[PDB]
Amino acid sequence: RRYSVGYALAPKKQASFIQVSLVNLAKERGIDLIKIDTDKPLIDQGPFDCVLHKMDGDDWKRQLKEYGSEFPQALIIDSPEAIERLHNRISMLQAVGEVEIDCENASFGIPKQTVIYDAKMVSAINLENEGLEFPVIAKPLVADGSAKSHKMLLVFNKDGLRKLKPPIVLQEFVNHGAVIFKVYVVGDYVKCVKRKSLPDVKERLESYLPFSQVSNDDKYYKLMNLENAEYPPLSFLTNIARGLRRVTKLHLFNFDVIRDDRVGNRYLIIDINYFPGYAKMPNYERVLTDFFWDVLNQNDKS
Ligand SMILES: Nc1ncnc2c1ncn2[C@@H]1O[C@H](COP(=O)(O)OP(=O)(O)O)[C@@H](O)[C@H]1O
Ligand SMILES: [Mg+2]
Ligand SMILES: [Mg+2]
Ligand SMILES: [Mg+2]
């Protein structure tokens, strides 16, 4: 009894994750959540049973390695190399190809994509020999959480390629009924929620369309409902989530799923993010508290 969890998170992540309910509920289960001062060497604090973190930069990486060398039995959530795979959008999706699950009901994968590094490479673009076709979507290569990294481009024809801002991933746009399925994972716990997405390109006035996250009224529109969109099968979502947990080596992540409406039963993972916002997930205090108990009780048992 009485495990300690040191946490190193940005101030806005502390405000949303470290709530009173979470602190107090973990404390009665015996989990002591302790704030890491990142302005002081990690190795000079604690020691902690577990280090939970979401910090950028090589020096934090240096400090984790330093810390884990002196306390090789402390659990690190999560491994910095595992987190780091999610920072380049090519390497981000590589784990999907390693997930092996029995599910002949439906297939899964990632959309076709190619990388455009600079201006010269835009000029050399040939979608055809890559098996790409227009409707493509250009995504910044680096997923660093900056505003820039979310600024995206829909390209409808040859012109509009001129609006690419490399380094970019060039990815086929998949008609998916205008709804993403965001799957949240905490260890073996799996929750899914629908969210609005881009409309289908009905195979207009522009050869490109930039869009982001912030993408008023007075212009008439009826907001489409997502009720009638079918969820992917529950068994498939949770088996893929737990396969991904095992391949990425990440305990806390979400991934975005779209259904490829061209086929019926093909699902594509288009995004995987480390340690997303959990504070409005129902019951998140008990789910996160039980997760810490489970992983600390597993690790303490070894
Ligand atoms: N291959 C694709 N086909 C169709 N829509 C896509 C595709 N990739 C991304 N999108 C749309 O763009 C949005 C952002 O893409 P995503 O890869 O999730 O970026 P971010 O990391 O900024 O969330 C998605 O929520 C989805 O609506
Ligand atoms: Mg400090
Ligand atoms: Mg996303
Ligand atoms: Mg993302």
Numbering used by the authors: 8 to 210, 215 to 226, 234 to 320
List sentences from the manuscript.
Herein, we describe a complex of ADP and StITPK1 at 2.26 Å resolution and use a simple fluorescence polarization approach to compare the affinity of binding of diverse inositol phosphates, inositol pyrophosphates, and analogues.
Relative to AtITPK4, ITPK1 possesses a “tether” insertion following the central subdomain, while AtITPK4 possesses a “tab” in the N-terminal subdomain. The tether comprises a polypeptide connection between the C-terminal β-strand of the central domain and a helix of the C-terminal domain running under the protein. In all the ITPK1s of known molecular structure where this polypeptide is resolved, it provides residues that contribute to the ATP cofactor/substrate binding pocket. Consistent with the absence of the resolved nucleotide, this region is disordered in the crystal structure of ZmITPK1,38 but in StITPK1, it is stabilized in most parts by adventitious interactions with a neighboring copy of the molecule in the crystal lattice. On the other hand, in the pose of InsP6 predicted for StITPK1, InsP6 binds with its “receiving” 5-phosphate in the F-specificity subsite, contrasting with the “receiving” 1-hydroxyl of Ins(3,4,5,6)P4 which occupies subsite A. Again, polar contacts to the ligand are made by Q224 of the tether region; thus, the bound nucleotide may stabilize the central subdomain and a portion of the tether, enabling recognition of InsP6 and catalysis.
